[PDB]
Amino acid sequence: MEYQLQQLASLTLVGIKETYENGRQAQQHIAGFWQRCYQEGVIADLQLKNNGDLAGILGLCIPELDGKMSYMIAVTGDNSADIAKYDVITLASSKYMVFEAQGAVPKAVQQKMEEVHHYIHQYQANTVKSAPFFELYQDGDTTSEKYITEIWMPVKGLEHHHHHH
């Protein structure tokens, strides 16, 4: 499978996190949460705040310590001045396997995400299950078959994996 290796410094992310039961229905709630964020002007409002650290809107999957699963819609921003209205987290610095899903959203992303998870199962000592992973949606027509969503999967110690030796 094709991927690029990328590294991020610690970043500040501003947005809204919701929490679901780890879901066979999760994708339905995530759809609804996207729909609501657009409908309520939240996406537009976050887009203003995007400081450019990452180009686009993030959909982060955040593991919770009670086993639940959170999804956060966010942008790289600057201020905890937004805490009144928004969730603000620090995305801790990490290396990533960065994959591309090309096709109309969400179908291409869902399908690519299945392939990714199956691919990365061979890298159990190198993925980081407690670290967020995310979809990155850059500017473009997400209905276009050429639209590319990036999938960022955090890794540690990947250079030691025997497949690279």
Ligand SMILES: CCNc1cc2oc3c/c(=[NH+]\CC)c(C)cc-3c(-c3ccccc3C(=O)OCC)c2cc1C
């Ligand atoms: C700039 C990024 N813009 C978007 C990103 C989106 O990401 C989505 C991720 C999803 N899961 C994780 C992969 C699911 C389930 C739905 C998503 C939708 C979506 C949500 C509700 C209803 C329709 C769609 C839909 O994609 O709109 C198509 C017209 C979505 C829509 C837009 C506009």
